[PDB]
Amino acid sequence: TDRVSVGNLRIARVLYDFVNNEALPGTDIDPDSFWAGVDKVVADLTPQNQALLNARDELQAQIDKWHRRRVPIDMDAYRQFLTEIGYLLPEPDDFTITTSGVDAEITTTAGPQLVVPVLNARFALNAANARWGSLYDALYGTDVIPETDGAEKGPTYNKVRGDKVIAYARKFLDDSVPLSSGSFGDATGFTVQDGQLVVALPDKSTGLANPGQFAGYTGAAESPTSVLLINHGLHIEILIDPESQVGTTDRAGVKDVILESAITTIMDFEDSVAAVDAADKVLGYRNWLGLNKGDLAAFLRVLNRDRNYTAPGGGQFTLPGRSLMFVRNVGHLMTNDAIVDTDGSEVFEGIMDALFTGLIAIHGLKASDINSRTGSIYIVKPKMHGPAEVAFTCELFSRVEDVLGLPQNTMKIGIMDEERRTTVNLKACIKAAADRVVFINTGFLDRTGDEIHTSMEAGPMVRKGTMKSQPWILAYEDHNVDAGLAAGFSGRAQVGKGMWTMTELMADMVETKIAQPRAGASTAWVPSPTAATLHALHYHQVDVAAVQQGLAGKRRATIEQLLTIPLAKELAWAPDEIREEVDNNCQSILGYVVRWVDQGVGASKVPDIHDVALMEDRATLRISSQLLANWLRHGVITSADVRASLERMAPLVDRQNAGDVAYRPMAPNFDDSIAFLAAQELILSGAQQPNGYTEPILHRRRREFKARAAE
Ligand SMILES: Cc1cccc(Br)c1C(=O)C[C@H](O)C(=O)O
Ligand SMILES: [Mg+2]
Known part of the structure; x- marks a missing residue:
């Protein structure tokens, strides 16, 4: 493996050539100033990064020994023990985040959030394009419509099944954008007349119970090619094409119900990708750069353009056609030999991602075929333990910004709540990032791993299936929303919850995952573009803004319930x-x-x-x-x-x-x-x-x- 010398660093060549020829061009940053900053930042911050890792190690060993002693389970001494060793820290005074310059998809829109492995360009394309999605296709191709007699997926199109699909969407239209009287099931056509949408029933005509929900249309208003609706900030498009195969058999000629789905997408460098050398990291980085430049392409699949509509009054407007993109960096733990120093020591992969994914993101703010219309770079930072590890991420972003030439606090951070020492100090973690934090999220599977390992010594844990209902996780999910809303997250940052892993059980998802918006969560995680379209249904039924308002001021989890160890x-x-x-x-x-x-x-x-x-x-x-x-x-x-x-x-x-x-x-x-x-x-x-x-x-x-x- 051949390296390039820059100060105390020996950068692997494939990464050196890649940053130089592909990622630096177009950012007005000087390659020598860049690499000098990489060297300087790495030398400056690698000490504290490793101090933080030893602190984990040290805290975990005192807890280890503490359990081994102990013959019961007195929760007041445990509390007093963890406080004394600095595991449990004081709760700061109440505050409100100041994070400016954040996009509407994050401060305001509630809806699904998709996570995708950045090393799979075909998946990363589909996720970016997953802002808009066919409800028919998601209902037809999954088990939301059961495959009972007559309605089973064939090699050709099943009309029995397709009719159920249509009926399902019509009830969604009724439950979401209701008519003054009558059902969308009984519609025969749509018009806009005098800046107002008018649905033709069999005997009469009706308009929206809330005409405000009418958002626009395409085609000639007398018979629009599609009708655009809004509800709860999320967009519904009824596509009207009577001579399409599905549309011919439809009473109003409807061809599809299009749902605004993946509002944001997280391009992932962490748990969903395998990347162990500079060759691997470059594949991901290059895909990340293609997404930011607008030209990632697989065939020949490409990223979608914005969507033009006609206002109800008659003007024109346009809508974001792609998903707003986060990138999830790796966390403080690992090093990668993509860069080694003169002693041969591998460089901390977390620091490398902030420099390289940050640099690459500048293209996303620039006119090539655009990501953050307000100026921000969105980095999900996983697997942090406590407030001091939040501050270190802050300091790291600060130093990467000026090496990159970006105004301070450009790189915003989505905080994962997925490590127990973060859970029990969550408010101090949020405070530590008050002017950067752009979401919090409960990474409950990582959080279960840390829960098990932290108390590995106390005794044998309950089975995996039983963790979903253990007291500590129930208090963890509530405690997360409370700290979010208390820090002023409503209208400012996302309060997010975790992943649905049963990719084939969409019936169960549509039935179960509604608990998350009901919980006050303005976003939650989906594993596919299809699951995003389905999860969007939940946000049309639940008024998350209203839900958050009713939770304001509530304190629903005790420190004692957070520390309830899932022993068997x-x-x-x-x-x-x-x-x-x-x-x-x-x-x-x-x-x-x-x-x-x-x-x-x-x-x-x-x-x-x-x-x-x-x-x-x-x-x-x-x-x-x-x-x-x-x-x-x-x-x-x-x-x-x-x-x-x-x-x-x-x-x-x-x-x-x-x-x-x-x-x-x-x-x-x-x-x-x-x-x-x-x-x-x-x-x-x-x-x-x-x-x-x-x-x-x-x-x-x-x-x-x-x-x-x-x-
Ligand atoms: C656990 C999981 C499964 C499938 C796709 C993704 Br994405 C994930 C997560 O990495 C989620 C998360 O960080 C967590 O800690 O639950
Ligand atoms: Mg995780």
């Missing part, structure tokens, strides 16, 4: 229960790692023991592996149990990769597979991974595979 009860499980939980964890562990290590895929649909398809990434692996590591620390299972289960499920994994050519199997030669040995190591060494993180082992084993594939 004496003799709480039977042999087949334990056997099932083990098998299930090993299968989710194995089926994710094998594609991580063997192919560099950081997010994969992996069916669990019940054959429920779950989109996995590092956080759910953080949970499966730390749970098994905890049952091992306390005797629930043995190392032969784990070895057995691993060899039990592994051939089933190899089989499931029946869909996927050029793939290496794990079974029978378990000790000859780097993926199997990594799966094993994540479990058997899980207790000793800092805060239960999976990157160290995953990264080291992925490079191992790459190096063995060099021969």
